[PDB]
Amino acid sequence: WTPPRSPFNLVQETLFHDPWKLLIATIFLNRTSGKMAIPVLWKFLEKYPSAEVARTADWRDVSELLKPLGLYDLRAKTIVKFSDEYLTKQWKYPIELHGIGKYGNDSYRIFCVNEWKQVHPENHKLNKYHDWLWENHEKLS
DNA sequence: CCAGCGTGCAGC
DNA sequence: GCTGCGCGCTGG
Ligand SMILES: [Mg+2]
Numbered sequence: 001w002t003p004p005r006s007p008f009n010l011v012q013e014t015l016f017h018d019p020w021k022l023l024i025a026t027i028f029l030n031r032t033s034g035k036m037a038i039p040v041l042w043k044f045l046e047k048y049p050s051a052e053v054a055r056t057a058d059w060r061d062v063s064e065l066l067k068p069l070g071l072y073d074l075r076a077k078t079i080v081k082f083s084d085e086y087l088t089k090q091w092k093y094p095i096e097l098h099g100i101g102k103y104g105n106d107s108y109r110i111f112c113v114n115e116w117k118q119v120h121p122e123n124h125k126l127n128k129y130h131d132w133l134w135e136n137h138e139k140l141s
Numbered sequence: 142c143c144a145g146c147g148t149g150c151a152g153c
Numbered sequence: 154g155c156t157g158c159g160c161g162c163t164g165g
Contacts, residue, residue, distance in 0.1 A: 010148070030149040036161065037147090070147090070160030078150080101150050125148035 001114040004140050008128050016111035020051045023094055026104035032069045054083035
């Protein structure tokens with residue numbers, strides 16, 4: 001399952017191979033523009049390349065990175081706990097994890113697994129991708 | 142100038 | 154169901 005690239009360039013399209021990273025991206029984009037968030041995301045993944053590492057992080061360090069994005073303390077603590085549960089808790093869908101809601105979940109079920117037909121998103125960008133996909137899937141296979 | 146917004150979410 | 158978290162960007 002390789003979700004296709006779209007004319008809307010959701011960052012999920014390039015991060016689907018690694019659900020932890022895709023899901024971290026969703027968190028980064030919580031009421032934050034991609035213009036601001038996505039450059040910080042690469043710095044974050046540089047310092048914390050995986051959930052194995054991130055769940056050991058000092059949340060104050062993470063907060064320093066998030067400072068320009070707003071929601072810096074909330075999200076930094078969420079990121080460390082989310083990463084912890086991602087690896088340690090039994091889950092089937094990541095909505096079961098702290099810090100992931102419907103939008104993150106929908107992103108997961110569209111990009112990381114082949115369940116896009118079953119998803120009913122309520123997020124504007126995601127709907128654009130998801131609607132577009134219903135219209136072009138036969139054409140793309 | 143500065144109010145509205147940004148690919149939300151958990152807690153209550 | 155509502156609210157707090159929160160910065161920089163935007164555009165009249
Ligand atoms: Mg959750």
